[PDB]
Amino acid sequence: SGAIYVGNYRVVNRHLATHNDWANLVWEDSSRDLLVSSTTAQGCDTIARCDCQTGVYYCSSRRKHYPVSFSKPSLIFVEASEYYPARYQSHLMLAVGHSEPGDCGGILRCQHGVVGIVSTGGNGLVGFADVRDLLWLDE
Ligand SMILES: COc1cccc(CN2C[C@@H](C(N)=O)CCC2=O)c1
Ligand SMILES: [Zn+2]
């Protein structure tokens, strides 16, 4: 679990969104595993607007943060799960690191701010859903 709070928005993994997120829906994209809902309280986070390929992410299954080198946002094949059929997930960035299903929502940050959230994993890999292209989050 985990979310990004920026301005009047809350960003979560689409497969983990609550009834409240869907009742206050702003935007969702099943192909990115992202959903954005509106909030009344002002958000605590800043979004990175950069091309960084190194950063640090929170791994809840280890209660630790890990430094990672990650690929550029791209279309990657993701195996079927209880939440989606087998499909290509877009705007996904891969890195070597520990991740288990419950780790989705952990934030990945660089020196400029929030880069994305954990969305995929297994086999010593961790995938992050990028949010840096969502410029409207800042307004
Ligand atoms: C860290 O996330 C992991 C780790 C191992 C396995 C998985 C598998 N999986 C893929 C997610 C997707 N973005 O399609 C949906 C939910 C899910 O359990 C995730
Ligand atoms: Zn950066």
Swiss-Prot record:
Catalytic-site annotation from UniProt: H15 (for protease 2a activity), D33 (for protease 2a activity), C104 (for protease 2a activity)
Binding-site list for Zn(2+) 1: C50, C52, C110, H112
Disulfide bonds: none
Coiled-coil parts of chain: none
Reaction catalysis annotation: Selective cleavage of Tyr-|-Gly bond in the picornavirus polyprotein
Quaternary organization: Homodimer.
Function comment: Cysteine protease that cleaves viral polyprotein and specific host proteins. It is responsible for the autocatalytic cleavage between the P1 and P2 regions, which is the first cleavage occurring in the polyprotein. Also cleaves the host translation initiation factor EIF4G1, in order to shut down the capped cellular mRNA translation. Inhibits the host nucleus-cytoplasm protein and RNA trafficking by cleaving host members of the nuclear pores. Counteracts stress granule formation probably by antagonizing its assembly or promoting its dissassembly.
Protein's recorded name: Protease 2A
Parent-protein residues present: 869 to 1007 of 2193
